[PDB]
Ligand SMILES: Cc1cccc(-c2c[nH]nn2)c1
């Protein structure tokens with residue numbers, strides 16, 4: 001059919017043949033084609049997830065306004081996301097919680113139950129959310145502002161991210177991507193409220209390889225010089241994301257934790273403790289190795305689960321991912337796209353008309 005104003009028509013119902021739009025195809029900076037065609041169903045899954053992502057974010061940009069609580073923004077975004085991705089257990093759904101980190105906080109912040117935070121006119125909000133089909137995760141994010149005073153900061157980071165995307169490729173050394181991203185990032189200077197800053201990358205934050213049902217596969221893409229010389233390989237999927245800040249350029253754990261994720265390497269652990277055993281079963285059935293938040297547990301009817309959750313974390317079965325913020329008073333911005341290192345080319349599968 002044809003998608004409605006407020007999204008409601010699943011992406012699979014808009015492409016009856018099962019073939020989904022490709023993202024932007026670029027050349028790296030027959031045989032290799034047969035190989036590409038061999039994993040076509042995989043690429044296709046990534047695309048379906050991206051189309052869901054592109055329509056969801058365009059919807060968000062249409063109504064996100066200061067005055068709304070952070071919980072309303074996330075629940076409205078997630079509702080639409082579940083609809084378009086046509087959530088089906090672990091076969092299709094949300095890959096991780098809706099990040100909406102504010103101001104000096106760069107990532108991993110999503111409201112828990114009872115959070116009364118309200119989006120403000122001067123807020124710099126990072127919307128980071130993902131969708132997946134068969135575990136093929138699409139990690140893509142953008143920054144939201146209402147005050148044009150951040151325009152230059154946003155452009156700086158957007159330009160740095162697209163620079164990282166362009167420098168990415170097969171045999172490209174990872175430290176060369178980080179060196180490039182920083183050089184562009186620091187080529188920007190901004191003025192916010194009578195003070196000037198040279199945008200700086202958040203050195204302890206970075207891009208990452210993506211694996212099936214594993215948001216952070218194992219390889220990291222730095223956004224500053226001095227990284228590993230490890231190379232990007234053929235067929236890998238990468239999340240290219242950069243963060244710009246007017247602070248120290250370093251983030252630290254802060255505020256209450258809302259993000260949690262099962263340790264991908266841990267195996268079966270028999271638990272006799274009633275509540276802890278139940279919570280783990282719920283995580284395995286609903287999220288598997290995909291990240292989740294406390295709101296997604298409340299949603300499923302769970303209550304009195306914090307202690308059980310803490311046990312799982314203490315056991316090393318679940319890992320907490322608290323908000324990562326720069327110093328108080330600073331501003332941070334982010335832009336992220338997922339790219340596929342296909343044999344015949346480089347596809348920025350999450351690319352949209354928006355960014
Ligand atoms: C490990 C972990 C937990 C929660 C969210 C992310 C994330 C979001 N965008 N990129 N990475 C990663």
Ligand SMILES: [Co+2]
Nearest residue numbers: 128139140141
């Ligand atoms: Co992300």
Ligand SMILES: [Co+2]
Nearest residue numbers: 139239241336
């Ligand atoms: Co990411």
